[PDB]
Amino acid sequence: KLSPDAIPGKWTSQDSLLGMEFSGRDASGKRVMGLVPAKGLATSVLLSPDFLWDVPSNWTLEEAASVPVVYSTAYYALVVRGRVRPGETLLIHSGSGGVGQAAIAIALSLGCRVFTTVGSAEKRAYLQARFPQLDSTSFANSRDTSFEQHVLWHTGGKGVDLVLNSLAEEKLQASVRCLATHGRFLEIGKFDLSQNHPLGMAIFLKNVTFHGVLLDAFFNESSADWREVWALVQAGIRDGVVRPLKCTVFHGAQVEDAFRYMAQGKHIGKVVVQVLAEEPEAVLKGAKPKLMSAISKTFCPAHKSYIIAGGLGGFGLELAQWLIQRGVQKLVLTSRSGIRTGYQAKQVRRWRRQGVQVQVSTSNISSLEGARGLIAEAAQLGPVGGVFNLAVVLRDGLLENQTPEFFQDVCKPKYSGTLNLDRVTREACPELDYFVVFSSVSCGRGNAGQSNYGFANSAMERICEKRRHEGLPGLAVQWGAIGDVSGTLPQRMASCLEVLDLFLNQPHMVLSSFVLA
């Protein structure tokens, strides 16, 4: 229902944005609970120290997994934005939920009167049991808009000074009418805001204040302001205001079950995923996660350097961008002509803006001196990580039309270039781990008028097969056709790159891909 692009911040096309908070041991073993913009639902999270809290000795790593997000957003909504004061009156929608529980816990500590809306009777009983100070006259119904009459009646027609709203459009409009003079409306939902539903400005004839509360801004900027909320939450933890919500634990392997259970909507408190069991020790010297079996994916170190031959071509630029999404940060593109097209310059400038150290070589791979120079100049950026050979020159025609010079020209970049790259890499690339050569379906399957092309591709395949037998890395991929940039439909680039990843992960020496007509 929610598009990944809707999450503020810069995010890779291929990635997961699930999970905002966690709890686990630090690198030194100290137990900590953190708050992250995304990617927090994993066996490891890379986080800044400014978003970590020390877990109290009396808490459990299971309990601390629920405190961060709900209490941080409750404090930001009330104390920082709404500036709640002791003795006021509040209306906190959806009390049972985590944010509602946090807001109620904060409010009761100050000494205000609280009106809360709960969908069902079990949630009402749970809230009544959890917060004894709260009274039966503090409850109402959230799914219906009947809380307006209740709040207005019990408040004597004045209304509620401070409103924490997370309901839909009609419930939002109902909530606005509950505001009293000098009221303050704290909006944490998104549906009405995203849809741009109109809001009558007559409510501002009173001194009402309308607040748009998004917590995702702190992860993106205004850290100087975020430390205020951090101090607030730490003070709440140590004073006793902050209490860990009820938790339901689903083991790591049963994550889908947790998602389904939360989707059903009968949960109370927070749902947590026990990725790893807590050790009895308070501080553990080695907090390394236990080995887990997960689908293989391709990523690259930043310090390594990656080379593409003919990388300025139609497939070369797409492969280069796919690599960068995997975090290459040091790229070398080889092409005799150089940057001659507008699209090439646009892509290169875009990459260099992000900080990538893109490079244009213009150094041939056919000449052994050329291969050595290309490898050397890529070594200057960093140790060579991988070499991709996407250089092609094609001369079409029946055999009677072909001449030895055409065969030599076609085989020079793919055949001789592959040999030179292999030689130089085995001589002076100990750290290299990727050696990919893009063959074609016309070789092997067969095609009319491309004998030289088939010869070159077959030679590249033979070289790649020989390299693997020695234990070195080597991959040959055969493509039926590429559409975006022999009886087979052109293949869209997205499918091409997904297939390329799959092939990179597999151990076979030669692989092929195509789409049947």
Partner 1 sequence: HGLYLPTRVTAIHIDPATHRQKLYTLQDKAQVADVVVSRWLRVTVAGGVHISGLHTESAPRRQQEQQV
Ligand X SMILES: NC(=O)C1=CN([C@@H]2O[C@H](COP(=O)(O)OP(=O)(O)OC[C@H]3O[C@@H](n4cnc5c(N)ncnc54)[C@H](OP(=O)(O)O)[C@@H]3O)[C@@H](O)[C@H]2O)C=CC1
Taking the least distance from each CB to partner 1, the nearer of 263 and 516 is 516
The CA–CA distances, whole Å, from 147 to 77, 240, 377 equal 21, 31, 71
> Which of the stretches 10-18, 118-126, 227-235, 250-258 binds ligand X when contact is defined by CB under 6 A?
118-126
At closest approach, how far in Å is the CB of 478 from ligand X? 8
Taking the least distance from each CB to partner 1, the nearer of 176 and 273 is 176
Choose among a second copy, partner 1, ligand X, none what residue 517 binds, the Cβ cut-off being 5 to 8 Å by kind: none
Closest of 505, 450, 503 to residue 477, by C-alpha: 503
What length is written for the chain? 517
Contact pattern from residue 8 through residue 27 relative to partner 1, giving x for each residue in contact according to CB under 8 A and a dash for the rest = -----x--------------
For residues 150 and 136, give the distance between their C-alpha atoms in angstroms, rounded to a whole number. Answer: 12
Task: Rule CB under 8 A: say whether 5 interacts with partner 1.
Answer: yes
Taking the least distance from each CB to partner 1, the nearer of 13 and 248 is 13
Task: Rule CB under 6 A: say whether 450 interacts with ligand X.
Answer: no
One of 23, 414, 422, 425 touching ligand X (CB under 6 A)? 414
Closest of 454, 452, 461, 451 to residue 512, by C-alpha: 461
Choose among partner 1, ligand X, a second copy, none what residue 210 binds, the Cβ cut-off being 5 to 8 Å by kind: a second copy
Annotated binding site: 90-107, 305-320
Q: Are 143 and 167 in contact (CB under 8 A)?
A: no
For residues 97 and 83, give the distance between their C-alpha atoms in angstroms, rounded to a whole number. Answer: 22
Q: Taking the alpha carbons of 445, 450, 453, 458 in that order, is the dihedral positive or negative? A: positive
Contact pattern from residue 158 through residue 177 relative to partner 1, giving x for each residue in contact according to CB under 8 A and a dash for the rest = -------------------x
Two tokens at 265? 């909507």
Task: Rule CB under 8 A: say whether 347 interacts with partner 1.
Answer: no
Please state at what angle helix 169-176 crosses helix 147-154, rounded to 10 degrees. 10
For residues 422 and 365, give the distance between their C-alpha atoms in angstroms, rounded to a whole number. Answer: 10
Annotated binding site for NADP(+): 90-107, 305-320
Q: Are 68 and 35 in contact (CB under 8 A)?
A: yes
State the virtual CA torsion across 452, 457, 461, 464 in degrees, nearest 10.
Answer: 110
CA 41 to chain centre: 10
Task: Rule CB under 8 A: say whether 489 interacts with partner 1.
Answer: yes
One of 371, 390, 491, 493 touching partner 1 (CB under 8 A)? 491
One of 23, 94, 138, 450 touching ligand X (CB under 6 A)? 94
Task: Rule CB under 6 A: say whether 391 interacts with ligand X.
Answer: yes
Q: Are 302 and 319 in contact (CB under 8 A)?
A: no
Task: Rule CB under 6 A: say whether 310 interacts with ligand X.
Answer: yes
Task: Rule CB under 8 A: say whether 209 interacts with a second copy.
Answer: yes
One of 138, 359, 366, 452 touching ligand X (CB under 6 A)? 366
> Which of the stretches 84-92, 147-155, 250-258, 270-278 binds partner 1 when contact is defined by CB under 8 A?
147-155
| Stretch (H or E) spanning 326 | none
Task: Rule CB under 6 A: say whether 336 interacts with ligand X.
Answer: yes
Q: How many CB atoms lie within 10 A of CB 504?
A: 17
Choose among a second copy, ligand X, partner 1, none what residue 449 binds, the Cβ cut-off being 5 to 8 Å by kind: none
For residues 456 and 413, give the distance between their C-alpha atoms in angstroms, rounded to a whole number. Answer: 9
Give the position of tokens 């920082």.
80
At closest approach, how far in Å is the CB of 303 from ligand X? 25
For residues 491 and 135, give the distance between their C-alpha atoms in angstroms, rounded to a whole number. Answer: 65
Choose among a second copy, ligand X, partner 1, none what residue 316 binds, the Cβ cut-off being 5 to 8 Å by kind: ligand X
At closest approach, how far in Å is the CB of 205 from a second copy? 5
Contacts to partner 1 from residues 189-208, by CB under 8 A = 196, 202
Task: Rule CB under 6 A: say whether 250 interacts with ligand X.
Answer: no
The CA–CA distances, whole Å, from 513 to 25, 356, 416, 488 equal 45, 30, 24, 10
Taking the least distance from each CB to ligand X, the nearer of 199 and 214 is 214
Give the position of tokens 């949960």.
267
Q: Name the amino acid, one letter, at 353.
A: R
Q: How many CB atoms lie within 10 A of CB 515?
A: 13
For residues 284 and 297, give the distance between their C-alpha atoms in angstroms, rounded to a whole number. Answer: 30
For residues 322 and 335, give the distance between their C-alpha atoms in angstroms, rounded to a whole number. Answer: 19
For residues 84 and 106, give the distance between their C-alpha atoms in angstroms, rounded to a whole number. Answer: 10
One of 479, 496, 513, 514 touching ligand X (CB under 6 A)? 479
One of 83, 197, 251, 288 touching a second copy (CB under 8 A)? 197
Two tokens at 306? 């990656």
Taking the least distance from each CB to ligand X, the nearer of 57 and 195 is 195
One of 18, 217, 428, 515 touching partner 1 (CB under 8 A)? 515
Task: Rule CB under 8 A: say whether 155 interacts with a second copy.
Answer: no
Contacts to ligand X from residues 139-198, by CB under 6 A = 142-143, 166, 188-189
Task: Rule CB under 6 A: say whether 17 interacts with ligand X.
Answer: no
For residues 374 and 420, give the distance between their C-alpha atoms in angstroms, rounded to a whole number. Answer: 11
The CA–CA distances, whole Å, from 486 to 414, 438, 443, 448 equal 21, 17, 11, 9
Query: Which spans of this chain sit near ligand X (rule: CB under 6 A)?
Result: 70, 73, 94, 96-100, 118-119, 123, 142-143, 166, 188-189, 213-215, 265, 309-310, 312-316, 334-337, 364-366, 390-393, 413-414, 417, 438, 440, 457, 479, 481-482
Query: Which spans of this chain sit near a second copy (rule: CB under 8 A)?
Result: 81, 181-182, 187, 190, 192-214, 217, 221-222
Query: Which spans of this chain sit near partner 1 (rule: CB under 8 A)?
Result: 3, 5-6, 13, 149, 152-153, 156-157, 177, 196, 202, 489, 491-492, 495, 515
